[PDB]
Design an enzyme around this catalytic site. Structure first.
Site, PDB file in Angstrom:
ATOM      1  CD  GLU A 279       2.790   0.286  -7.364  1.00  0.00           C
ATOM      2  OE1 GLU A 279       3.480   0.568  -8.378  1.00  0.00           O
ATOM      3  OE2 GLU A 279       2.667   1.073  -6.418  1.00  0.00           O
TER       4      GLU A 279
ATOM      5  CG  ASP B 230       8.950   5.018 -10.309  1.00  0.00           C
ATOM      6  OD1 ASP B 230       9.356   6.058 -10.879  1.00  0.00           O
ATOM      7  OD2 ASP B 230       9.091   4.846  -9.080  1.00  0.00           O
TER       8      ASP B 230
END
Ligand code: MTN
Ligand code: CL
Ligand code: CL
Ligand code: CL
Length: 164
Positions: free
Chosen positions: A11, A20
């Site tokens: 992440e 994202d």
């Protein structure tokens, strides 16, 4: 290696609101804020999540707090889901981490949808499960991360995460 170190690798860590892989406003260690295209909506979610007026920037400690909550939520979600729980319970600790990783990325409902892969995992048909898992939007959109998670399910080792 453990689930926290694993997800931290997958992440990253960013202290300002960013988009994202799907183009959604996110912050910290993969903390999704909203699917709304409104930055203001995202900032409102952030302020609510942190408990203060942040204006889109947080501290490392704050990022890690959201991360702890999110990992906890992913595990809690697996255990409350009738499709995910039996699979999770049937797995060793390393493969459990792989399942938590998937849930963290795509949500409980999304992972619960992988009916055939879940059955192969429950059956401990690791190579077959690995092949099935790759036949997915997930794999095509995030192939490097999917490959790491799939290797973890195939081998029950942290081989895909060492040196990273
Ligand atoms: S079937 C999984 C399950 C979820 C929850 C609602 C938390 N439960 O009490 C059980 C264990 C039935
Ligand atoms: Cl298949
Ligand atoms: Cl496919
Ligand atoms: Cl990727």
């Amino acid at each position: 290696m453990n689930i926290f170190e694993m997800l931290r690798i997958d992440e990253g860590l960013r202290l300002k609101i960013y988009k994202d892989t799907e183009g959604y406003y996110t912050i910290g260690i993969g903390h999704l804020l909203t699917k709304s295209p409104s930055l203001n909506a995202a900032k409102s979610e952030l302020d609510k999540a942190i408990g203060r007026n942040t204006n889109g920037v947080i501290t490392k400690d704050e990022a890690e707090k959201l991360f702890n909550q999110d990992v906890d939520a992913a595990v809690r979600g697996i255990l409350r889901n009738c499709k995910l729980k039996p699979v999770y319970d049937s797995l060793d600790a390393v493969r459990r981490a792989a399942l938590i990783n998937m849930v963290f990325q795509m949500g409980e409902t999304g992972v619960a949808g992988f009916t055939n892969s879940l059955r192969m995992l429950q059956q401990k048909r690791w190579d077959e499960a690995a092949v099935n898992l790759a036949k997915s939007r997930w794999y095509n959109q995030t192939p490097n991360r999917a490959k790491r998670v799939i290797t973890t399910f195939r081998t029950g080792t942290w081989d895909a995460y060492k040196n990273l």
